[PDB]
Structure 1
Amino acid sequence: KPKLHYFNARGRMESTRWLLAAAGVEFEEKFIKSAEDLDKLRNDGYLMFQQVPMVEIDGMKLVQTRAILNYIASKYNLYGKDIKERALIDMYIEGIADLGEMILLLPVCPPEEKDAKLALIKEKIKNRYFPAFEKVLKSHGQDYLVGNKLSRADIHLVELLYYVEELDSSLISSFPLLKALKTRISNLPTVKKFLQPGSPRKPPMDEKSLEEARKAFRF
């Protein structure tokens, strides 16, 4: 079992939870709750750059979201059939990462900038990101983003579609193929399981969860 070291929160570990679950991989979690928990991880040499996320997997102690995700996707054949498909996957998911990052950091936005930043995220979703992925899907008409088979790109995108829905459910309304992809991926047995109550899937981060993490870093 892979062991995920993070707070009991989405943050920078949630995409890994999604990917592992989608891949049908059982995993364990060790939740950081105190500064002492982080002290131990840091002191035991568990964190290369003294940060989490960190995943213990196949004898490695992997930090950096992308190192973790790239390893898991390759292992479970969700990173395409070759270098060219991996390139398309990388391009798609890094756009997904860019949008993901804006939403992720939204609750730490300066209050006086919050209105404008939300308006910008929504604008970008409407005009930049959703059209881009809608375009890819219409280009080949296939059930999956790349190579006509399930890959990390479908998983990463659909995870993001759930977050966009949380933000504003109307944003996906003019994108039928994204909606269709959301439905298809959500019905894959592993993902259907992950979306159901009782799975390691984390709730939206509230102020309390945010502050507990800050206190743990003693910021």
Structure 2
Amino acid sequence: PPYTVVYFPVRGRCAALRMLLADQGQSWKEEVVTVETWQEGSLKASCLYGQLPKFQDGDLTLYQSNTILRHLGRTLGLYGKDQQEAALVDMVNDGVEDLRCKYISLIYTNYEAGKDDYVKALPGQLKPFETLLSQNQGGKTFIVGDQISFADYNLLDLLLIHEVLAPGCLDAFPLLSAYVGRLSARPKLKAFLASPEYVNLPINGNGKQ
């Protein structure tokens, strides 16, 4: 198997790259890291920024989830068909990252106090991606151009975890909803999304969702 994913037993910042790997018919080894292993200290100390995911593609070793996604996109043709489209994919993914940061802050540092304000503010954070969809072939293909990209898998995961956090949060965004259903029903992705290696994992690392 060409790829190794080294992460905690969490969906987290690895859910999107896992989706990408599964939907593209790739195989990969999961190295699961428990609390005991991480506290041991040597794995962490070997990690560039002392964090996970760690990712192996042959004898290339990568850290940072967004770096990993861009890498897979580069080498599996999921980065747009020209340089202009590649910039657009960078835009979209960076917006996805900003919102994911806000989500992670809510989850890990302010769930009970912040959830109401967060759900009240969420439609403003989702409207940019519906605008994006509506300007690209009526939103009936992918988020950028007419072929799938790594930003699609990233945006999809962000949308799914938000539909967990605030159910019905996509009712006001018909295009984003049809987009979730369409990408979710792709066959290899569907299979992965229903497998135990996905369902048995919590979204996050602190029991909140």
TM-score tier (shorter): 0.7 to 0.9
1:22, 1:155 within 8 Å by CA — same for their partners in 2? no
Equivalent of 1:138 in 115, 134, 139: 134
Q: Deviations over 1:55-101 (max 9, x none)?
A: 01121111111221111111111111122111111111111111112
How many angstroms does 1:3 deviate by? 0.9
Are residue 86 (structure 1) and residue 82 (structure 2) matched?
no
Structure 2 unmatched runs, 5+ = none
Count of residue pairs brought into register by the alignment: 203
Q: Deviations over 1:4-61 (max 9, x none)?
A: 1111112332222122122221111111114445523246x4x222221100112111
Distance 1:64 1:180, change over 3 A: same
Corresponding letter in the other structure for 2:33: I
Sequence identity, in percent?
29
Q: Deviations over 1:113-156 (max 9, x none)?
A: x42x32343234202x3211111222231311111111122221
**1:14 alignment counterpart:** 15
Distance 1:94 1:119, change over 3 A: farther
**1:212 alignment counterpart:** none
Question: The residue matched to 2:6 in structure 1 has which SS?
Answer: strand
**1:177 alignment counterpart:** 175
**Structure 2: how far apart are the matches of 1:153 and 1:102?**
18
Distance 1:30 1:147, change over 3 A: same
Corresponding letter in the other structure for 1:29: E
Corresponding letter in the other structure for 1:205: N
1:96, 1:157 within 8 Å by CA — same for their partners in 2? yes
Distance 1:34 1:88, change over 3 A: same
**1:214 alignment counterpart:** none
**RMSD, matched Cα:** 2.2
**2:153 alignment counterpart:** 155
TM-score, normalised by the number of residues in structure 2: 0.86
Question: The residue matched to 2:13 in structure 1 has which SS?
Answer: coil
**2:42 alignment counterpart:** 40
Equivalent of 1:122 in 119, 122, 138: 119
Structure 1 unmatched runs, 5+ = 210-219
Question: The residue matched to 1:20 in structure 2 has which SS?
Answer: helix
Distance 1:206 1:59, change over 3 A: closer
How many angstroms does 1:110 deviate by? 4.3
**1:217 alignment counterpart:** none
